[PDB]
PDB file of C-alpha atoms in Angstrom:
ATOM      1  CA  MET A   1     140.630 -84.506   1.485  1.00 48.84           C
ATOM      2  CA  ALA A   2     136.907 -83.656   1.909  1.00 50.12           C
ATOM      3  CA  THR A   3     136.525 -87.446   2.069  1.00 48.92           C
ATOM      4  CA  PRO A   4     136.423 -89.660   5.010  1.00 50.17           C
ATOM      5  CA  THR A   5     139.496 -91.407   5.204  1.00 53.04           C
ATOM      6  CA  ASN A   6     138.381 -94.698   5.307  1.00 53.00           C
ATOM      7  CA  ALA A   7     135.770 -94.220   2.849  1.00 52.55           C
ATOM      8  CA  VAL A   8     134.728 -96.397  -0.484  1.00 54.73           C
ATOM      9  CA  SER A   9     133.910 -93.924  -2.828  1.00 54.09           C
ATOM     10  CA  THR A  10     134.112 -94.294  -6.533  1.00 51.87           C
ATOM     11  CA  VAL A  11     137.224 -93.361  -7.293  1.00 54.85           C
ATOM     12  CA  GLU A  12     138.864 -96.562  -5.677  1.00 56.64           C
ATOM     13  CA  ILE A  13     136.260 -98.798  -6.713  1.00 54.66           C
ATOM     14  CA  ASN A  14     137.057-101.340  -9.902  1.00 54.14           C
ATOM     15  CA  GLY A  15     134.549-102.779 -12.481  1.00 51.99           C
ATOM     16  CA  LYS A  16     131.882 -99.706 -12.757  1.00 55.06           C
ATOM     17  CA  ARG A  17     129.508-100.815 -16.142  1.00 55.51           C
ATOM     18  CA  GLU A  18     129.753 -98.021 -18.879  1.00 54.40           C
ATOM     19  CA  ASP A  19     126.803 -96.269 -19.463  1.00 53.37           C
ATOM     20  CA  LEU A  20     125.707 -95.877 -23.161  1.00 49.75           C
ATOM     21  CA  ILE A  21     122.559 -95.185 -24.212  1.00 46.10           C
ATOM     22  CA  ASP A  22     120.930 -97.175 -26.920  1.00 42.36           C
ATOM     23  CA  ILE A  23     120.189 -94.438 -29.409  1.00 45.14           C
ATOM     24  CA  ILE A  24     121.698 -93.161 -32.404  1.00 45.53           C
ATOM     25  CA  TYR A  25     120.847 -89.048 -33.266  1.00 47.14           C
ATOM     26  CA  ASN A  26     120.649 -88.735 -37.396  1.00 46.50           C
ATOM     27  CA  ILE A  27     118.882 -85.429 -38.141  1.00 45.55           C
ATOM     28  CA  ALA A  28     120.988 -85.394 -41.989  1.00 46.08           C
ATOM     29  CA  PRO A  29     118.603 -84.518 -44.667  1.00 46.18           C
ATOM     30  CA  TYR A  30     117.534 -86.491 -47.575  1.00 45.28           C
ATOM     31  CA  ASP A  31     114.647 -85.118 -49.305  1.00 46.79           C
ATOM     32  CA  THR A  32     114.512 -84.756 -53.449  1.00 45.70           C
ATOM     33  CA  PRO A  33     112.264 -81.697 -54.020  1.00 43.78           C
ATOM     34  CA  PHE A  34     113.516 -81.704 -58.158  1.00 46.65           C
ATOM     35  CA  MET A  35     112.658 -85.711 -58.352  1.00 45.30           C
ATOM     36  CA  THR A  36     109.371 -84.845 -56.495  1.00 43.78           C
ATOM     37  CA  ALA A  37     107.579 -82.225 -58.700  1.00 45.90           C
ATOM     38  CA  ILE A  38     109.028 -83.800 -61.948  1.00 45.45           C
ATOM     39  CA  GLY A  39     106.855 -86.708 -63.922  1.00 48.44           C
ATOM     40  CA  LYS A  40     107.325 -90.076 -63.914  1.00 45.22           C
ATOM     41  CA  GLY A  41     107.508 -92.649 -66.607  1.00 40.68           C
ATOM     42  CA  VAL A  42     108.884 -95.654 -68.293  1.00 40.54           C
ATOM     43  CA  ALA A  43     111.622 -96.204 -71.184  1.00 42.57           C
ATOM     44  CA  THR A  44     111.990 -99.515 -72.939  1.00 44.82           C
ATOM     45  CA  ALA A  45     115.394 -98.776 -74.733  1.00 44.78           C
ATOM     46  CA  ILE A  46     118.546 -97.591 -74.138  1.00 42.77           C
ATOM     47  CA  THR A  47     117.927 -93.895 -76.139  1.00 40.52           C
ATOM     48  CA  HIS A  48     114.737 -92.677 -75.526  1.00 40.89           C
ATOM     49  CA  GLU A  49     113.303 -90.420 -78.283  1.00 43.66           C
ATOM     50  CA  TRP A  50     110.768 -87.412 -78.469  1.00 45.36           C
ATOM     51  CA  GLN A  51     109.797 -84.498 -80.929  1.00 44.60           C
ATOM     52  CA  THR A  52     109.100 -80.692 -80.960  1.00 44.89           C
ATOM     53  CA  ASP A  53     107.673 -78.207 -83.252  1.00 45.39           C
TER      54      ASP A  53
ATOM     55  CA  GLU B  54     142.027-111.216  -1.809  1.00 44.38           C
ATOM     56  CA  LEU B  55     141.240-110.713   1.554  1.00 44.07           C
ATOM     57  CA  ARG B  56     143.634-109.846   4.681  1.00 47.94           C
ATOM     58  CA  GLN B  57     145.425-111.610   7.653  1.00 45.83           C
ATOM     59  CA  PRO B  58     144.037-112.146  11.127  1.00 46.12           C
ATOM     60  CA  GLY B  59     144.942-110.438  13.962  1.00 46.89           C
ATOM     61  CA  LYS B  60     144.383-109.855  17.526  1.00 47.99           C
ATOM     62  CA  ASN B  61     140.956-107.763  17.904  1.00 47.81           C
ATOM     63  CA  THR B  62     139.980-107.436  21.941  1.00 48.34           C
ATOM     64  CA  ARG B  63     137.769-104.542  21.702  1.00 52.00           C
ATOM     65  CA  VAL B  64     136.664-102.414  24.919  1.00 52.94           C
ATOM     66  CA  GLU B  65     133.182-102.524  26.259  1.00 54.75           C
ATOM     67  CA  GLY B  66     131.249 -99.499  24.547  1.00 52.56           C
ATOM     68  CA  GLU B  67     134.056 -98.228  22.979  1.00 53.65           C
ATOM     69  CA  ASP B  68     133.277 -95.665  19.732  1.00 49.28           C
ATOM     70  CA  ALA B  69     133.763 -96.985  16.574  1.00 51.23           C
ATOM     71  CA  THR B  70     136.435 -96.422  14.171  1.00 51.14           C
ATOM     72  CA  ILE B  71     136.352 -96.783  10.726  1.00 52.16           C
ATOM     73  CA  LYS B  72     138.732 -99.657   8.970  1.00 50.88           C
ATOM     74  CA  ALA B  73     139.987 -99.237   5.628  1.00 47.83           C
ATOM     75  CA  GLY B  74     138.820-101.422   2.451  1.00 48.74           C
ATOM     76  CA  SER B  75     139.389-103.873  -0.164  1.00 48.56           C
ATOM     77  CA  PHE B  76     139.308-103.160  -4.011  1.00 50.29           C
ATOM     78  CA  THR B  77     139.503-105.842  -6.944  1.00 49.86           C
ATOM     79  CA  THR B  78     141.670-105.549  -9.820  1.00 46.84           C
ATOM     80  CA  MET B  79     141.019-105.989 -13.493  1.00 45.01           C
ATOM     81  CA  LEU B  80     142.059-108.751 -16.223  1.00 39.90           C
ATOM     82  CA  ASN B  81     140.983-109.032 -20.213  1.00 39.88           C
ATOM     83  CA  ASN B  82     141.986-111.013 -23.157  1.00 38.08           C
ATOM     84  CA  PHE B  83     141.705-110.617 -27.254  1.00 38.55           C
ATOM     85  CA  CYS B  84     139.847-113.019 -29.453  1.00 39.08           C
ATOM     86  CA  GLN B  85     141.339-115.177 -32.003  1.00 39.27           C
ATOM     87  CA  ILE B  86     140.192-116.786 -35.269  1.00 43.19           C
ATOM     88  CA  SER B  87     140.803-120.001 -36.622  1.00 42.58           C
ATOM     89  CA  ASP B  88     139.237-121.571 -40.231  1.00 44.27           C
ATOM     90  CA  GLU B  89     139.458-124.498 -42.730  1.00 43.62           C
ATOM     91  CA  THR B  90     138.695-124.865 -46.070  1.00 43.85           C
ATOM     92  CA  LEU B  91     137.680-127.402 -48.686  1.00 45.90           C
ATOM     93  CA  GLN B  92     136.730-128.371 -52.525  1.00 47.83           C
ATOM     94  CA  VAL B  93     135.196-131.396 -53.900  1.00 47.25           C
ATOM     95  CA  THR B  94     134.732-131.762 -57.425  1.00 45.24           C
ATOM     96  CA  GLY B  95     131.086-132.672 -58.403  1.00 42.86           C
ATOM     97  CA  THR B  96     131.727-136.312 -59.921  1.00 39.59           C
ATOM     98  CA  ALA B  97     133.237-137.400 -56.609  1.00 39.74           C
ATOM     99  CA  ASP B  98     130.150-136.276 -54.864  1.00 43.76           C
ATOM    100  CA  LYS B  99     128.086-138.955 -56.744  1.00 47.54           C
ATOM    101  CA  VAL B 100     129.798-141.928 -57.092  1.00 47.94           C
ATOM    102  CA  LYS B 101     130.875-144.839 -54.808  1.00 46.66           C
ATOM    103  CA  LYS B 102     134.459-145.916 -56.025  1.00 46.00           C
ATOM    104  CA  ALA B 103     136.147-147.106 -52.432  1.00 46.52           C
ATOM    105  CA  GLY B 104     136.116-146.250 -48.972  1.00 47.14           C
ATOM    106  CA  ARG B 105     135.628-142.296 -50.027  1.00 45.85           C
ATOM    107  CA  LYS B 106     132.245-142.139 -51.561  1.00 42.36           C
TER     108      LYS B 106
END
């Protein structure tokens, strides 16, 4: 009751707009160490073949 | 909305007293989707036969 008796406060008014910020906070990691480490190349067929000795 | 009138008849130089207030009301409604579909053969879109061409 620690409010003036006939006082217009945020409790009894209506139509207050919401406060939603325009930022989405995402910090999930998506790095690929092994992909970055190894080499890249081109394959020209379904099966890729090589030789060892 | 507003209120009803009455006798005011204030005394000269009297101290003021706070007098209530008025508030609003909320209303809401939902949305609705309407649609239509159409299919026409390729031949009917090229010829000019009778009325509908």
